[PDB]
Structures are given as C-alpha cells and as structure tokens.
Amino acid sequence: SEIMKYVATTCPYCGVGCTLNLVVSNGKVVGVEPNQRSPINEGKLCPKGVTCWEHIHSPDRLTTPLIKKDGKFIEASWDEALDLVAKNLKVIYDKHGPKGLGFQTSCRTVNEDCYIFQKFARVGFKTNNVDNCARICHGPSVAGLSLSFGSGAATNGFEDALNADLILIWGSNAVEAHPLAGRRIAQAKKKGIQIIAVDPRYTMTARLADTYVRFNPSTHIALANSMMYWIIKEGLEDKKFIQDRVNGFEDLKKTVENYADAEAIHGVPLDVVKDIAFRYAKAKNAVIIYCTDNVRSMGNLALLTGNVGREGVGVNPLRGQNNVQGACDMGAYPNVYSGYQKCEVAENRAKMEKAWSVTNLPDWYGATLTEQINQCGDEIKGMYILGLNPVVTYPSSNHVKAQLEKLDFLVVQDIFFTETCQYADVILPGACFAEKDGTFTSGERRINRVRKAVNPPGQAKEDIHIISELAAKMGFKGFELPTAKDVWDDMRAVTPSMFGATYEKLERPEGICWPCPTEEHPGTPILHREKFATADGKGNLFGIDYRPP
Amino acid sequence: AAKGDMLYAWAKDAEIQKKGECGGAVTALLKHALETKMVDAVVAIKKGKDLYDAVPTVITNPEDIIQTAGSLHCGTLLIPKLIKKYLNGAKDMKLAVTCKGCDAMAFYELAKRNQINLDNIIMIGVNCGGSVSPVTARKMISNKFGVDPDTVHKEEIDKGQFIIEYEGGHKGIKIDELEEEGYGRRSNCRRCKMKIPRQADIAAGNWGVIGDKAGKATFLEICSEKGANLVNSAQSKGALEISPADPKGIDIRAKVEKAMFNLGDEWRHRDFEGMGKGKDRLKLMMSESSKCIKCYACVEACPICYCIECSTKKPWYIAPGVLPTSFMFHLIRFAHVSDSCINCGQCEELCPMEIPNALFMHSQQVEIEKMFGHIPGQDMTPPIHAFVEEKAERARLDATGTDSIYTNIFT
Amino acid sequence: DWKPQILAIICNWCSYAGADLAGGARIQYPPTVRAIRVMCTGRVDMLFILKAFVEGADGVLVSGCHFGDCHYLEGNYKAAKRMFMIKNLLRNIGLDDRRFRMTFVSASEGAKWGMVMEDVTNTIKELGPSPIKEFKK
Ligand SMILES: Cc1cc2nc3c(=O)[nH]c(=O)nc-3n(C[C@H](O)[C@H](O)[C@H](O)COP(=O)(O)OP(=O)(O)OC[C@H]3O[C@@H](n4cnc5c(N)ncnc54)[C@H](O)[C@@H]3O)c2cc1C
Ligand code: SF4
Ligand code: SF4
Ligand code: SF4
Ligand code: SF4
Ligand code: SF4
Numbered sequence A: 001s002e003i004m005k006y007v008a009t010t011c012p013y014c015g016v017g018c019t020l021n022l023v024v025s026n027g028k029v030v031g032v033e034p035n036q037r038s039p040i041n042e043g044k045l046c047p048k049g050v051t052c053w054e055h056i057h058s059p060d061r062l063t064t065p066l067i068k069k070d071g072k073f074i075e076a077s078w079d080e081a082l083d084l085v086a087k088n089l090k091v092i093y094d095k096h097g098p099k100g101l102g103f104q105t106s107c108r109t110v111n112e113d114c115y116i117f118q119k120f121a122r123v124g125f126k127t128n129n130v131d132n133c134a135r136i137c138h139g140p141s142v143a144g145l146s147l148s149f150g151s152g153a154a155t156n157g158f159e160d161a162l163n164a165d166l167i168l169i170w171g172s173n174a175v176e177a178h179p180l181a182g183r184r185i186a187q188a189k190k191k192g193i194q195i196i197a198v199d200p201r202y203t204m205t206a207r208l209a210d211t212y213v214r215f216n217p218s219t220h221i222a223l224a225n226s227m228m229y230w231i232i233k234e235g236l237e238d239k240k241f242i243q244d245r246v247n248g249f250e251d252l253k254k255t256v257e258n259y260a261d262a263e264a265i266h267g268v269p270l271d272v273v274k275d276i277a278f279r280y281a282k283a284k285n286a287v288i289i290y291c292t293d294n295v296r297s298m299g300n301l302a303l304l305t306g307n308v309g310r311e312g313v314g315v316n317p318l319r320g321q322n323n324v325q326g327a328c329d330m331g332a333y334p335n336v337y338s339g340y341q342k343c344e345v346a347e348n349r350a351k352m353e354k355a356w357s358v359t360n361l362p363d364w365y366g367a368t369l370t371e372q373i374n375q376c377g378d379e380i381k382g383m384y385i386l387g388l389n390p391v392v393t394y395p396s397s398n399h400v401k402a403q404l405e406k407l408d409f410l411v412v413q414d415i416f417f418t419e420t421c422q423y424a425d426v427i428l429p430g431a432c433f434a435e436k437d438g439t440f441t442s443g444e445r446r447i448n449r450v451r452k453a454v455n456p457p458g459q460a461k462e463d464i465h466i467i468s469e470l471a472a473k474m475g476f477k478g479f480e481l482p483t484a485k486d487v488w489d490d491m492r493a494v495t496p497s498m499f500g501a502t503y504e505k506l507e508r509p510e511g512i513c514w515p516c517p518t519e520e521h522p523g524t525p526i527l528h529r530e531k532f533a534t535a536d537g538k539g540n541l542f543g544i545d546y547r548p549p
Numbered sequence B: 001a002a003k004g005d006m007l008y009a010w011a012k013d014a015e016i017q018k019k020g021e022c023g024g025a026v027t028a029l030l031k032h033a034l035e036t037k038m039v040d041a042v043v044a045i046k047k048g049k050d051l052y053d054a055v056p057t058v059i060t061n062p063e064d065i066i067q068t069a070g071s072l073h074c075g076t077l078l079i080p081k082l083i084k085k086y087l088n089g090a091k092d093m094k095l096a097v098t099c100k101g102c103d104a105m106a107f108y109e110l111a112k113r114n115q116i117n118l119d120n121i122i123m124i125g126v127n128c129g130g131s132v133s134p135v136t137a138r139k140m141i142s143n144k145f146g147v148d149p150d151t152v153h154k155e156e157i158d159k160g161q162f163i164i165e166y167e168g169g170h171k172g173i174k175i176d177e178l179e180e181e182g183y184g185r186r187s188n189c190r191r192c193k194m195k196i197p198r199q200a201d202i203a204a205g206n207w208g209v210i211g212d213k214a215g216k217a218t219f220l221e222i223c224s225e226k227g228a229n230l231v232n233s234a235q236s237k238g239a240l241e242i243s244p245a246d247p248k249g250i251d252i253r254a255k256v257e258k259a260m261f262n263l264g265d266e267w268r269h270r271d272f273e274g275m276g277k278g279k280d281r282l283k284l285m286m287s288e289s290s291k292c293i294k295c296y297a298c299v300e301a302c303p304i305c306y307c308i309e310c311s312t313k314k315p316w317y318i319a320p321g322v323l324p325t326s327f328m329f330h331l332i333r334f335a336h337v338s339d340s341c342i343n344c345g346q347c348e349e350l351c352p353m354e355i356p357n358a359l360f361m362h363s364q365q366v367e368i369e370k371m372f373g374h375i376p377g378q379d380m381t382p383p384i385h386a387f388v389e390e391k392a393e394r395a396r397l398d399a400t401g402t403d404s405i406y407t408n409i410f411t
Numbered sequence C: 001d002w003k004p005q006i007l008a009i010i011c012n013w014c015s016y017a018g019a020d021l022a023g024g025a026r027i028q029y030p031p032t033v034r035a036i037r038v039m040c041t042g043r044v045d046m047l048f049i050l051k052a053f054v055e056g057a058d059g060v061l062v063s064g065c066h067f068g069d070c071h072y073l074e075g076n077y078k079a080a081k082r083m084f085m086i087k088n089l090l091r092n093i094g095l096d097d098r099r100f101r102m103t104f105v106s107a108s109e110g111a112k113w114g115m116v117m118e119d120v121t122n123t124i125k126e127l128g129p130s131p132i133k134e135f136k137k
C-alpha cells in the first residue's frame, strides 16, 4: 500500500499543541518525525512527543465490546452491547428523571467527541450532570481568571512573550511540563529579556531566570499582596489603565495595606520583594506565566500594572492536558453550553432549544466530578465515563471503588483495559489520537487539526460514531453527523464565537485562536484587545486576604 | 555520458520541463529510472502544503514524480537517516534518491558505518547554496520584505539574494544583509562548503548555464559510471535532451563555487571566534548545555549516531532521573561524532532548548580535520578510530618531537 | 585546602610493572596520583577520560608501553590516537589540555615512572583547580 507516509497531527500529551508527523507504513504507525512547518514548535518536540507513537499498536488495546455476564467479561457484538446500554439508560431515565444519570469525559479527547458527548447528555434526557478532568486536575483557575477578566483563558499566546521585557515565571515548572512553552523562556533569555522566577523550589525553569526567589509554599496570596502594596505605595500603578478599564481599586487598597512586612508568612526579605515589585511595575511590557485566590491575585497584579491588552504582555496560565481548553470550550461543564454560553440565561437556553430542536433544557447547575462520585448511590445511578480512570486518578481510591460498586450500570469507553473497567457493565472500545480525525485546542486558545493515520485496531470505533449509534438506538434526533466536519459545523452553528473556524481555515498550519466570530476574521491571538468581557466591559480586581492553613 | 562530462540537460516532456526549477532533468531522470525499472522506488521531496512545507515521499507510481518537480528552499530535512529507519536501509530494494550536499555526505557516513547499501541507492545530487527554516522564512517575508507570506508563489536564493514572487511582482534582498539582520540561511548552511556534490552519481544545478538556456537547462556533471549509465539510458530512450556544456559556463561555475567556499570560510571564522576561547568557551558550552531536557532529538537525528542504545542512556554515565543533566551528555557526543560531523544542522534545529549543537560540533570537527586530515562524507574512508595505522601513529609521535603526548602538538 | 586530584590509568604489562619496580627500588615521589590498572591502554575508552574530567580530575594521566612493545601487538597505537583526539577536544571545550598527558613507560623504567609522577604533580599544581567544579554549581 503505502511506504513511509507522513501524516501531520497534534501531540496529545499537553496543552502546547505541538505538531508532528506520524510515519505510516502498511497501515502501521512506525515512528514520529519533525514537522518544521509548524509555528507552535518549529519541528521540535519533547520526549513525550518524540515517543508518542509507541502506545498506538500495543496488543493490550481494546478490540471489541465486553459485557460483564455474571463475572469475567465476555466478548460482545456492537449491536448487542449498544442495545444493552440503550435499554439500561432508558430504564434509569424513566425511573429517576435527569438527576439519576451522570456523564464525564476526559480532556484527552477531541473537540468533536466532547461536543457530541455533551449534546448527547443534554438533547436526550435533559441533564447538566456533564463534567471532565479539569476539576480534579490542578487548576480551577479558570473560574478565578474569569472573575478577574471575563474569559478564563490565557490572554496572550506563547510566541508573544518574546516581546516583553520582564517575563515573570511564577510557581511554574514550565520546562518539566510544557517544555516547548519553556522554549520561549530560553529564546527570551538568549534575546536578553529580564526573567524573574518565583517558584518555591529551584527548578530547571528557575535556572533560566536572572532572579530566583524562594518563598514558603502556600503563600502566593501573601507574596503578591506585598508586591502590590509596594507598587501602590510608590505609585507605579497605571493611572489611565486603572481609571479607564479596571474597577475595585479601593477594595484592593484596603486589602493589601496590611502586607508591608510579610516576611513572617513568605520567606522573602523586604529587599527582594521591593526588587521584584519595582522591576515588574517599571517594566513597560511584562508577562506573567502561572502554573482560585491564587489566579485572581495574578489578575490583580496585571490589572494593577496595566499589563493586559497588548502585544508582549498578559497572563498565561498553563493548562497541562492536551484538550482541557477544548473540552471546556465545547461545553463539557455543568453550567456552560458551548463557547462559555451560560445555561443560567434563558436567552441562549432558548437558542439551544431552537437550534437543537429540543425543549425544556434543564438550566440547573449540574454536578461536578466529585459531586457525582460522592452522590454516586444516593441519587445518581448509571454513569457513562468517556475516557476516565477514576479509581487511579481520584484521591481515596478505595472510596472511589466503594462508590462505583454502589452504582447501577456503569458504562466505560476506553482504548485500554484500565482498573476502572472491572467495575463497568459494558465496555465500548475506542480509538486513540492516531485513529480519530478531530481537533485539539491548545492552552493558547489555538485550534489544531488531528489527522487520521491508521484504522482502529479491530472492531473498535471512534466516539462520534459510538455516540451517534447509541443515540440512533435510543431514538434521538440530531445525531446524524457522520464526520468530525459535520460535528464541527453543528457546533459552529450553535456557538457565536468559533463561527469562523471552518476546517478549510484549520487546514492552515497556523490553526485558529478561539474568539473567531466571522469567516473572514483571522482570529484573536491576544484577548481583551481594548475592552474586557465582564458586565461593564471592565476588569474587576479583588482584595484577597491570606488564609493560613 | 562518461564519468566527468559536463552537460546541459532538459526534459523532453514540456510539462516536466515547465515544473522543473531549471530544465526538469532531475525529474526526467527519476521518472525514467522508475519506469524502466532500474529502481523500485524514488525518495524525493514534494510540497505537502504551501511551498514552505517540504515532505519526503517514497514514490512507486511513475505518475507521481511530476508532483516532486521543483526545488523547495525551505526543505531543511535530511533524507538518508529516514531510509535506514523506515526503508530497512535499502538492503533489499533499489532506490533513486535526490539529495543535497549534506544528504550525500550523510549517505556516505551511514554507508561507512554499514547502515545503508550504496550499491542499491542511486544519488542524484543537486547543488545547494543554502536552505532556510520555513518559519524563519515566514518571519523574513512578513517583516523585511513587507509581504503577507501566504501571497508568495515561488521563492529562491539566486545570485546571493532572496527573490520572492508574489501577486504584484517580485522582490529581492541580499542574503548577506538578511544574515546580518538575523535571518537568512541556516547557520550551518552559512558555514557549509559542500556546494557541488561530486561524491554523488550526478550533480545538477543552475550554475554555469548561460545564454539562450539560462532558465530552461540543468547543468549536469556526471560523477560516476552508474550516473553515466542512467544518463545514457535516459537520453537514448528519449526522456532527456543532452548538449555539451559551454566552456564559459564551466569557468563561471568554478568561480561561483570558489566564491561560495570563501564565504563559507568567513562564516566559519566569525562563528568559531564568536564562541570564545579558554575558560569563557567552557562557560559558554556548560551554561548552554545545562538547558538540555534529554529529548534525544539530536541523537535520533544525527546521521553519525547509529547505536542501538546511546551511551548517554547508560546509568553509569548519566544518572537516569537527574534532569539538570551533566556535561557528560554532550561530552559523549563530542567524543563520538566530532571526528566525522557533516554539519547538517539537524541537531541544532531540532533542539527544543535552542542549544547550538551544530556550532559546537562543527567547531570541533574542523580542526579534528586539520589534525588527522579526514574529510567526512566524501568516500568510503573508514573513521579515524575504526582504522588506526602503525606508521601513522609513529609519525604523529615523532612529529611532536617528544617522548610522550603532552605538548608541541598545537600552534 | 586544595590538593590536586590526579588519576592515572596504567597498563598491566609495562606501566604497572614500572611503578612496581620503582616501589621495589624505593624511589620516592609525592602521593598525589592514584591508578586504575587496565590490561592494555587500548582498553582506555575516551569516555573514561571525559568522565574523570567531568567528575573533577584536576589531571588525568594514561601510561602505557612504548610503541612496538605492547603486550597485545598494537593496542597502544589505538590509545595514542584516542588521546591525541582527547587533547583536541579538551582544547576546544576550553579546558586546559595540559591537564592530560600520555606517557610511555617500559617495565624497567622505575626511575622514569618516578620522574613522570613528579612532573605530573608539578604541572597540575601550577595549573590549579579545575574549572568544572565551579562551573557546575
Ligand atoms: C534548498 C535548495 C537550495 C539550492 N540552492 C541552489 C543554489 O544555490 N544553486 C544552484 O545552482 N542550485 C541550487 N539548488 C538546486 C537547483 O534547484 C537545481 O538547479 C535544480 O535541482 C535542477 O533540477 P531540475 O530543475 O532539473 O529538476 P527539478 O524538477 O527541479 O528537480 C528538483 C528535485 O529536487 C528535489 N528537492 C526539492 N527540494 C528538495 C530539498 N529541500 N531537499 C532535497 N531534494 C529536494 C525535488 O524533489 C526534485 O526531485 C538548490 C536546491 C535546493 C533544494
Ligand atoms: S511540549 Fe507538550 S505538546 Fe509538545 S511534544 Fe511535548 S508533551 Fe507534546
Ligand atoms: S548544509 Fe550545505 S548542502 Fe546542506 S542544505 Fe545547507 S548549504 Fe546546502
Ligand atoms: S536535542 Fe537539545 S534538548 Fe534534546 S537531548 Fe539534544 S541537546 Fe538536549
Ligand atoms: S552532530 Fe549535528 S551537525 Fe554534526 S552531523 Fe550530527 S546532526 Fe549533523
Ligand atoms: S552519541 Fe555515541 S553512543 Fe550515542 S548514538 Fe551517537 S555514536 Fe552511538
């Protein structure tokens, strides 16, 4: 057939979204090659990207559906397994309404599968009990940055920090995780850019920094409060910015004026505090790289120094999962439909109803991952898990196992036989990133294409196909979407932003950044261009008091 | 026609001759070899996307080489290591491969180390005056040329300037001016001196073609009997036209080659003294190499690194988990590669941490060369440590005029 | 506070014999060099020398048989070529190449072994502490 064919794809291992070539010989992925054309990484990959191809053709991959029949799983046909799932979901619905079910997907999955998953969870039985890894993962920082600015995403890109004078890494292992985001720090120091690292431990990304600052762990609020106190005290705040685009300054004033001497809390001497504070406030264009109160303090700093809406500046919280941003965008949260359209507002609730040809959408705040797992027997019973391994990921794994065994009809879709699989009643095999054909979304809001290299191992299918077949079994209208392009077009019709991100535009190696409202718009690589995304269009900066644990 | 002839060559097929960068002779020769069954496949470069994307391609259908026609100056890749990894080193199948000077040198390095079969491989070599990274070319065009890069149709380095053809006209800027401003050819391409691959089987270029054929003929130099046979077969079956080259063309070809040698020497100088001398060079090297995150891209991309397991992976040399890795990691590559480095730049350009691997390695290589007199990538000469000789060892000890190896070795 | 750390890698058949003969003849020299004793100097890999220098050897000495007197017919020609190349690498990484030398000591040259010991110690003392130990940090 084919000998050494190159297929361009996105790396599935973190939020940088590096591009790579998979080498496919006789329908087998046999290696990973650089793609020098990519703007994100210029053909450069970390160890994970270099060896992403190893797990694709493992013998352990699930090949056919499995059904727990009075013990060990026996081999089932697709029709059999799907009819079983449809029957059990139907009965649990008809007995316990929409509260009885529970959905959660992984951030490993492509945008089209996250969107169709949340569409399945809402168009059919109307439940907002949909969620994903981002809760239990490191950062609920999206909510905090949303409160500060309006969009919880990173304000600027990665190439953008090359334009600053004062990259300020803060508590980030940006070279251990996101190494090709830390490549920007390496390039910047080669260009001679002031770099200040502030992690509690001397990490390999703190080696690159001109100044390194220890502080006692769990004291970010105190340290940032001190820095803002000195900025206010010597008046290096940005008056036009604060008076024009920011609100809450008096509250910040009261809250911070109690942090003149905080050496007791954080270990940083007042001399070093003044040094970093004045370097940051004096830098004309300074970018913060972060990795709830902790992220709102960063928003406080950026708003206080007027470092937001411009090239070479901003706040860039690093995500960590390959498609966590994409899942949140597609609307795999309890409270947002898609593109962060809140379900609390009847306006877009009715817009969803009209677009999806369904009625009486829930509008109540769903149950997050831990909410579901804790109430996994009390009112929730019946659970579809799209790619999670909760027994290995959640803390108190034994409690997780107890709750899952308290559960009626778990369904698990995975590419491998995990530990959570033993507790499933049905196991639907899935496809990995080399067999899907969707899109990922980087941490810098960039939509990248994933391309099909090989076929799923045996009888395994990809998630859009599985969910469409299940919805056709259960009699649900609106899941007639045979391709990732059709799923994407349905999503685009639904969402106001991302309306310009057609696949003919995503076939560009550059990709598209998420606020792309029209088809001629080139994208929005820098957010909050001259107005924010809150009610008055003005960022709010809050006063946080440090709580000792 | 016989191993040393210098010819003008263009394709009989008008479409092949249009799509060739010059006369289409590389694409006519490759097509002929494939369809007359000298070779079982053809490894060439095609555009996968915009002309800034160069994708290697194994082609077995003779109908697909018209897609390979044209030269991509943003193709900074290296072919021979892909043939060893995913084509079993050409141990069972004949191939015909289009290659630049660095790609011919890499072929010879891997054949020295027994990793490919040059009896099976046919190397059609192209002249190379330099390659540009695709993304750097984009930034060049956006900033210095003041053009939207997606507008460009074709783009080439001709007469030492960067001609781009966009909608509206064409432009040109001296590559030396660009290279001073911080753009241009890759660093190793600036230092390169393998301009006409005379170690390949055929050397094709646009240098020395003068007069009525200045854009519709390829200057061919027949560098081996295998290439002579390929050319004679193509000319007889009528896929290729041959006229003897013009002596004035040969002369100015020699002059341009010599000038490119001098420019390469100048860049070698300014770069190697830019690295420093004494303990300053050790702080440059050590502080740069402290960035390495052990992605091993430099090892996997180097043509000379053919080892099943690198010694950089052995726990008695490098501690497995310590990430701010030792200088031993790069000392083990200086020791193993620097004697034969072909200055391909792959190690430098695939490094996520932007470490000047190629600059360090070539700075060591140039004077390992002027010490032992071994030029990498030219022929089947075994590596310096794979062939030690009694008389030569006596000679270097006597030349030091000393009873040991301590001093009077360098000037 | 500082004592030179010199490491020697001496072959078994001429340099170890020469050092043993010097000891037997009671030739005194300073106690600064510690030896490793491989069979031939052909065994000495480049990575041994580089590993020593990166661990912090202020000096490295490799001692073997004279040319034409290797126990294994030609194993010290290979070592000589390797050490010439090592001298070149250390000069181009900016470390002082006179921290390394290769001496040819026969089995009967105990006096010459003592003189080699003295001269290596003197040269390293002049050179001073190696820079790697502070460049690491
Ligand atoms: C990056 C680059 C720089 C060059 N610089 C010069 C120069 O300064 N002076 C000069 O006289 N000639 C240069 N050449 C060669 C020049 O294009 C030749 O005149 C041309 O190859 C003649 O062949 P043709 O037009 O007859 O056949 P063509 O139809 O052009 O055949 C060209 C062949 O080269 C292959 N190819 C294309 N891009 C690459 C690449 N990046 N790496 C390897 N193979 C590739 C194509 O697949 C095709 O088989 C350069 C070539 C490249 C690729
Ligand atoms: S930096 Fe992240 S996305 Fe890029 S190759 Fe490494 S793990 Fe994959
Ligand atoms: S290294 Fe030399 S031969 Fe290779 S592309 Fe650069 S200039 Fe051409
Ligand atoms: S490519 Fe660069 S980062 Fe990767 S191992 Fe080599 S030197 Fe280190
Ligand atoms: S060390 Fe780097 S420049 Fe030298 S041959 Fe290997 S890849 Fe090419
Ligand atoms: S560095 Fe040395 S051991 Fe490692 S792959 Fe290259 S040649 Fe082999």
Ligand code: FES
Pocket: C011, C012, C013, C014, C015, C039, C040, C041, C042, C063, C064, C065, C070, C071, C072, C075, C076
């Ligand atoms: S036996 Fe001593 S050098 Fe070989």
